[PDB]
Design a protein around this ligand. Structure first.
Ligand SMILES: Cc1nc(-c2ccc(OCCCCCN3CCN(c4ccnc(N)c4)C3=O)cc2)no1
Ligand SMILES: Cc1nc(-c2ccc(OCCCCCN3CCN(c4ccnc(N)c4)C3=O)cc2)no1
Lengths: 245, 58, 297, 242, 242, 99, 58, 49, 49
């Protein structure tokens, strides 16, 4: 009852057998904007199927010497589907997300991941190492795309903050003895009712192994990690020509 | 007090008591807040809750 | 006319926030109730599953034998007003006689709390904050001595002419506010509203402010939202000639009428720059202390 | 005019004085507030949230810092032998500094309530074992054997489907409150010790790894409180933030 | 006497302090007030008043300054070509400084509401034409052709008896309010662009002039507001007014 | 040509939504626009000079000498107002003296 | 307050609330004004008004 | 402001002045009090010993 | 000019005049001059007992 789950939104559908319960980020569901909070006068558009469905990004690999990854949302979908081809036309954007993660393994493998959702995860460089040299992170590390970007110093999450306290955010684990997936639902987290989808990046998904993968020879070494996600309650406003960036 | 509702907390669902002299309520005192909590927003935000005694996974 | 059925049963147009939870009062800690021994199957609070990402629910009553305890310990000092409404240093402005910083008797300070880490690390626990404030100004020579000198302050909002000298015309302060004050008098002290266009001060912005081909020479505008740059704070020694006395001006902020959102982790590495979370990489000290053996203290 | 008489405590700036001050911008109405998810009215909502505990705080070098997060358990003879120990002192230097609880007790002197420490096993499904977790209250020395830590508050856990167990550190004190502890006379406010042991063994079949890892998760219960706010020891600044 | 205790904020002159001050002339009753036409209780009564907009702000010399007021339209092939552009930023340096709106947004930082730009045609009665006015919201670059500006908010107007048309610049913003914009990071608060184009052509018979002129008229709507008063940049004084 | 402003609105030109505006209009009033002090005069009493060396000075009451405050009032023609003057005395160095 | 009606606004059709100590009301505070407007005095002062939809010239 | 007029006995510290002073720790609730044997409310309880 | 700062237990004691413990963000403090009257503040019952 708590293990088996199904997720049907749009034309698409997900099944899973060895799962856990579902999480709702910060204790509430997505929503469309109120006429009181809102400020813009133009009538939005709300497709409700062509955008609110499961998109599948890219399939990583989990070796024994792996460190971690992150993805920025909603940057991941700005070149993918009728979602992306609306977000280029319009200027204002609002949405939620459901986020599903896959990693399977047998009953001889062992490991644990941490699947967390952090709003406004600014990236910070190392200041040249000495501390004095001021630097800034390039464009391909702040909006790396759908292909993700790998961490170098995961103990501080590349921002001077520990990973030991990342559970205060909406988190889940993937202990390969117990489960094989993590489902997280998130509302729209921002101070402003609408905001751009290309410049601003509202939150970042992280996937960091704590206990490393391990097995014995004769067993399958390739242990992929796949990332699936779906917009929800998507609105758009400010129509004009398409802007890549 | 026949003052203005300029304060930041105008729109919150808690009650304060304050002391003021100028007509602008952001010059008032901090005061006492209403004592409330909601740990289930950060500790147990799950969709289908479970019982203490009965094991979660079934 | 909405004559189809998929439009009638539609979930579109829902301005309501479905909340699973609901707040409750707690002026005191919880009163521990009495328990006794239990030797049953099925019932088993100790065994949890943390993969779900929720905290435990086991308690003293359901693990051991307790007594009744009527707890009267308040929870009032852990609030945010009782945690933030405590003044701290946020800035310094020097007006020396002859030097290199500000020798001509004036100085401009860009309003930014992020320069001292006792107060920065308290706010950087949260992401979005909505607060009034109460600044306080302490003037003194380097020796601490108190001198008979007149001073002027002027809040320069955005889009207004920054003064470029001591004998300038921006000091008429017809529309801008200002504070004349002496050093023989007590500290100056004024109140501040929530001045942003947005609905909250976000200490963390993940994005760029402008559109464009983001080249490497324009990466210094990463983490810059202009909905927090609340302007400039000017100060000068009143007169037509230079002063007889050096001066230093210290600025203290006290927050009140606070609301916060989005808990997130806490800094463990030393701060280096402003508007920038950078850390030293060759000097990553651990979060805390260390020892020699897991099997020994 | 009306006679007054200025008493002491005059022309003083106390930082913690909740008083009235003059405004600068009259008839200023700020921006309204929309609904933002995640409003937190009190810090106890956070101290009741589990965060990883660094029992394995032996390494120092920047490559092996992630090893602090988890300690191993391997296969042994079966004599009932020691695996790990740590104190139950949150505000004190140790494993508890990794937490959001041990960092919010730096901004508050005294504390109270019961604590909770949850463990989790990242081993293989085809593995088995049992462990004897214990809490040795103050006064008593560190146990030398498994048949001495047993005499205190203890929990026994079987590895299985439910991959976790909760140890609970109740409130045992002469005082209602406890200021933080350190070496000296302030060990009058020490909490105790945790001391983990083997009850049977770590058993595993052919084909699976011989060594596993355990992760811990420290937090509080609903009777935790703090008071007498202060400033912390860790001031994360060398010179000028420029 | 009655004990008092002087707090900080003492012996200070804040200019914006609405307090009481002593008089000099007691029992002074001033002159009564007759009815004077034109009492204005608030500045928004003026910001809703059209004033000429200087789209043609190329000239500088003191003889051709009146040329700023109007831009021409002549006869062309019919390819759908560009005539003029300008921004929708009132508080920013540009055409909008000629207005009474753009000068009352210098004494106020933030603004809101919808704007309106009315055009008028000073050509001959026997002339005809059509035009494609557009509003290109933020983010998007300046349109290169007429088939790209079309994709935004646009209006089409036929020359005729009614010698005017109203473009309306609605409120499209992530923020409720907008502080003024300039080159830098404050282009986060840019309004957009206006971009005028030819839809058919400028047609005219024998005997009439080949070139005409268009006049523009900028103003606001009823949802405009301003706040956080300040002092402007233009201080019209060199030395001493003697 | 009539010399009246337009009346077209967002509703009657494009498609809008409902928006419940709570933005106040209180800071555009005249008291909230004019009741902000500004400089109107200066009086010098130097030791030895040419303006006013004999320890006295007469100033003709006239606000029209500094243009931040003159340009605010010169938006209007007729004005009816009370006032609140304030006097700040100081040597040229800003020093404060027992006089 | 048993003071005099010396203020300048004595004769206006709006209401204020003020704070005063001296007997002369021109020493009182500015206060809050009544929030009103009349843009049709400067924008549409015409004799025969016209409708939004219907064109003016007919 | 409200006219005042400072009388003598001003800016003086009399030790035996039962007056009000400012606090340092707001919202500080101290520890409760258990029953301790031997509460003495007045010294005459001792002079009769 | 003078500064005072209540340093509770467990807090960093300052080791110099130009130290960082004087920012007094969370600790209380009292700025005061000598030309002013005596400083004076109130105190609660601060014990665990
Ligand atoms: C007369 C006179 N008036 C005044 C007078 C002077 C200044 C005033 O504004 C005080 C506003 C405090 C602003 C506090 N915030 C909010 C966000 N933020 C930052 C900063 C840098 N980076 C980030 N990421 C965030 C920051 O620093 C008001 C009044 N004094 O003299
Ligand atoms: C004790 C003592 N009492 C005082 C004390 C001193 C002066 C006082 O009058 C202040 C009246 C302000 C007058 C303001 N106006 C009105 C029109 N107008 C001008 C001027 C020049 N040209 C034009 N076109 C118009 C002008 O300047 C009252 C009191 N201070 O010390």
């Amino acid at each position: 009852s708590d293990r088996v789950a199904q997720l049907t939104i749009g034309n698409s559908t997900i099944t899973t057998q060895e799962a856990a319960n579902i999480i709702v980020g910060y204790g509430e569901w997505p929503s469309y904007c109120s006429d009181s909070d809102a400020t813009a006068v133009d009538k939005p558009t709300r497709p409700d199927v062509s955008v609110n469905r499961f998109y599948t990004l890219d399939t990583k690999l989990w070796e024994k010497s792996s460190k971690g990854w992150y993805w920025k949302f909603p940057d991941v979908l700005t070149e993918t589907g009728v979602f992306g081809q609306n977000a280029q036309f319009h200027y204002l954007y609002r949405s939620g997300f459901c986020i599903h993660v896959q990693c399977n393994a047998s009953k001889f493998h062992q490991g644990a991941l941490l699947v967390a959702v952090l709003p406004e995860y600014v990236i910070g460089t190392v200041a040249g190492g000495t501390g004095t040299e001021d630097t800034h992170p390039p464009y391909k590390q702040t909006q790396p795309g759908a292909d993700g970007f790998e961490l170098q110093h995961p103990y501080v999450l590349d921002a001077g903050i520990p990973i030991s306290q990342l559970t205060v955010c909406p988190h889940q684990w993937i202990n390969l003895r117990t489960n094989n997936c993590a489902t997280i639902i998130v509302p729209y987290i921002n101070a402003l009712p609408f905001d751009s989808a290309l410049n601003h990046c509202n939150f970042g998904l992280l996937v960091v192994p704590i206990s490393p993968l391990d097995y014995d020879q004769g067993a399958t070494p390739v242990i992929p990690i796949t990332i699936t996600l779906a917009p929800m309650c998507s609105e758009f406003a400010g129509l004009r020509q398409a802007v890549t960036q | 007090s026949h003052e203005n509702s300029n304060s930041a907390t105008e729109g919150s669902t808690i009650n304060y008591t304050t002391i003021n002299y100028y007509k602008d309520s952001y010059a008032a005192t901090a005061g006492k807040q209403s004592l409330k909590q909601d740990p289930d927003k950060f500790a147990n935000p799950v969709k289908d809750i479970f019982t203490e005694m009965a094991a979660p996974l079934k | 006319g909405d004559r189809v059925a998929d439009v009638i049963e539609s979930s579109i147009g829902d301005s309501v926030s479905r909340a699973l939870t609901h707040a409750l009062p707690a002026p005191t800690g919880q009163n521990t109730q009495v328990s006794s021994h239990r030797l049953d199957t099925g019932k088993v609070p100790a065994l949890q599953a943390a993969e779900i990402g929720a905290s435990s629910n086991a308690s003293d009553e359901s693990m051991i034998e307790t007594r009744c305890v009527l707890n009267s310990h308040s929870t009032a000092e852990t609030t945010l007003d009782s945690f933030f409404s405590r003044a701290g240093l946020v800035g310094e402005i020097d007006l020396p006689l002859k030097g290199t910083t500000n020798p001509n008797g004036y100085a401009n300070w860009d309003i930014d709390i992020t320069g001292y880490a006792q107060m920065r690390r308290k706010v950087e626990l949260f992401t979005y904050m909505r607060f009034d404030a109460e600044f306080t100004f302490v003037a003194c020579t380097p020796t601490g001595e108190v001198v008979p000198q007149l001073l002027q302050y002027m809040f320069v909002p955005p889009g207004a002419p920054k003064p470029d000298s001591r004998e300038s015309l921006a000091w008429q302060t017809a529309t801008n506010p200002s504070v004349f004050v002496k050093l023989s008098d007590p500290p100056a002290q004024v109140s501040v509203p929530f001045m942003s266009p947005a609905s909250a001060y976000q200490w963390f912005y993940d994005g760029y402010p402008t559109f464009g081909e983001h080249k490497q020479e324009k990466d210094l505008e990463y983490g810059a939202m202009p909905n927090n740059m609340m302007g400039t704070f000017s100060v000068r020694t009143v007169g037509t000639s230079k002063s007889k006395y050096p001066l230093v001006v210290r600025i203290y902020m006290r927050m009140k009428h606070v609301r916060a959102w989005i808990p997130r982790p806490m800094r463990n590495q030393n701060y280096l720059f402003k508007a920038n979370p950078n850390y030293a990489g060759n000097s990553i000290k651990p979060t805390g202390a260390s020892r020699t053996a897991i099997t020994t203290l | 005019g009306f006679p007054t008489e200025l008493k002491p405590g005059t022309n003083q700036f106390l930082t913690t004085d909740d008083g009235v001050s003059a405004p600068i911008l009259p008839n200023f109405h700020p921006t309204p507030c929309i609904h933002i998810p995640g409003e937190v009215r009190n810090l106890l909502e956070l101290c009741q949230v589990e965060t990883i505990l660094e029992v394995n705080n032996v390494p120092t070098n920047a490559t092996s810092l992630m090893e602090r997060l988890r300690f191993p358990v391997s296969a042994q003879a079966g004599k009932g032998e020691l695996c790990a120990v740590f104190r139950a002192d949150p505000g004190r230097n140790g494993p508890w500094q990794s937490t959001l609880l041990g960092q919010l007790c730096g901004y508050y002197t005294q504390w109270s309530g019961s604590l909770e420490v949850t463990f989790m096993f990242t081993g293989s499904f085809m593995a088995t074992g049992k462990m004897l977790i214990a809490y040795t209250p103050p006064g008593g020395p560190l146990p030398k054997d498994r048949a001495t830590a047993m005499l205190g508050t203890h929990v026994i856990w079987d590895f299985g489907l439910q991959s976790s167990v909760t140890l609970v550190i109740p409130w045992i004190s002469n005082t209602h409150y406890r200021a933080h502890a350190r070496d000296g006379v302030f060990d009058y406010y020490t909490t105790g010790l945790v001391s983990i042991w083997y009850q049977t063994n770590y058993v595993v079949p052919i084909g699976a790894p011989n060594t596993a890892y355990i992760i811990a998760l420290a937090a509080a219960q609903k009777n935790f409180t703090m008071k007498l706010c202060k400033d912390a020891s860790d001031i994360l600044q060398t010179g000028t933030i420029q």
